[PDB]
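Recap quiz, item 2
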Amino acid sequence: STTNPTLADVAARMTPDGKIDPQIVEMLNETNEILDDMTVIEANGFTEHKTTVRSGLPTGTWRKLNYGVQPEKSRTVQVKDSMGMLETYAEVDKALADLNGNSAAWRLSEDRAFIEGMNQTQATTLFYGDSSIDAEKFMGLTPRFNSLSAENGQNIIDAGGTGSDNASIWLTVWGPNTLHTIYPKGSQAGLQSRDLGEDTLIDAAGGRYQGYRTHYKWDIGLTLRDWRYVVRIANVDVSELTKNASAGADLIDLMTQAVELIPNVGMGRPAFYMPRKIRSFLRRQITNKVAASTLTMEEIAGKKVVAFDGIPCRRTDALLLTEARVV
Amino acid sequence: VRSGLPTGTWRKLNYGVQPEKSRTVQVKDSMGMLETYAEVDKALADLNGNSAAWR
Amino acid sequence: MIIDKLLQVSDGQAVTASAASTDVIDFGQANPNTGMDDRSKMVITVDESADAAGAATVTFSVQDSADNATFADVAATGAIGKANLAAGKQVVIPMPTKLRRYCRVYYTVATGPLTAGKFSAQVVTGIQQNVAYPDSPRIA
Amino acid sequence: MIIDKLLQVSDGQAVTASAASTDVIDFGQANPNTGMDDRSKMVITVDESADAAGAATVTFSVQDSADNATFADVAATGAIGKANLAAGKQVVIPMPTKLRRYCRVYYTVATGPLTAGKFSAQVVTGIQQNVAYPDSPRIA
């Protein structure tokens, strides 16, 4: 019945009176920015990246004179975290791309949607990355911080909102020992767009079908050395946000409590991660807060948020707005 | 205008995965013409010679 | 949407029984094949609505003839239901590629008779169809 | 005439009863609307012929679906009579302007059932159609 996918003769659909349409309007692509901002260091293990992390300090004792006090011992657990590889080959019939004379123009335009689908997927998975169910993928910021019971439960700040319509803000600190990405030894990250070249394909019938193919490897996992460098602001009920930080949960303060949750941002480099929705409301709320103080007439709308603390503030589309509420 | 992205896949080991196809619909939209004539009986415009002033 | 008044048939015809269009288009040849201009297409707009006793359907269809006398279908829509004919519903039938002299538009009405609703049929190049397409849709 | 290996549905289907086409074309989007290309169009070729007890008619019509389960006419041909379908008879339907995912071809067979006949349906850009046209016509 249905043939999937695998590039039909709607190469025609992408054209004017003429060649491949250069100005196709990029609708489904979003400019979330972790992928540029996140750091990459090669993972240390085979299919993993091990990290030994101190679990218990020795206590010490006050000793009365004449009485040997006990020796002490640092109990210590170590934790490794897994990966996933993300790639596709991308094949096209050699004739369909050559015809109407648009061989390279098609290859390019088909490619851009590919880099974009790749970034969209890497990025949505980086925040809501599972593994008890998806198995194949590396596990991302939730649910390493899901339940409030976690040793980093103190690290998730309840925005206070409830119900199903509630976002969260993330603040992470990307650096080699606090939080970073990993690619295996030695497959390199990140995104390798290799072109396989023309090569023959095989028909269901038996027929040579002389045609193209392109690869898009991109294999990452994600180390969270210590959750202390990451704060989750769960349950920001977005229906309930009002710009006058009045009803619902205020952002500016809720956030400064997030800066205060991080032990000493020294390394490597911090970043805010909020859905475009919040980025707008945080904008409105900042100009709502300073207006009752000192803001100019022409700066009445307010500069769009850039450096919150200063920390760079990154807009991330690839961050679900209606995520289920945490308990 | 781009209608669908290839998603890519997490691929389990040793398993040749599907190619993707970036679906894309196009839209055409039209024009309209808005025009009008503006007539006066020449006899009415001519008097007191305000033919041009009237026009 | 530009319209040629001469290629206009059924200017605002009140379709009640399954009747044909008022005017019948006459080309200046035996095989105009203006389906071949790869540009022309019949459009039927709706006003005011498919009011009927119901449930009724309206099948718009282009018909050819050699001479202005006996017609036969060359394109058809299908039984478009009442309440799919709100005020403002362009039903485009692409011009059939093998046209003959004298094209007309017939309205195959499923029972019961339509009680109120006009339709305006015209050959244009081409329709205004720019409906919005999704973006994320995660946001949103 | 180039043909897409993939958009080919009903390769040489022995339509004897009013059956739907073997394969159903599946686009990878909700509303492909590929009629807007002003370029794609369904073409049905005939083989060897619509031989039947007769006189019967065979109507080609495109069907949509949200999902590959329930279809509805979005284009049709009309009652192509039998003895208009000898081997090499293209019924061209221009692509309907508002497509959904999963298009198919149904063969609305008027009674009685056909005794013989294959049909090839596929979406192309475009048909090869060139009849010679008269000239003066006093000579020739």
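The interface with chain C takes residues 1, 3, 25, 27-33 of chain B (CB under 8 Å).
Chain B is about 15% helix and 0% strand.
End of item.
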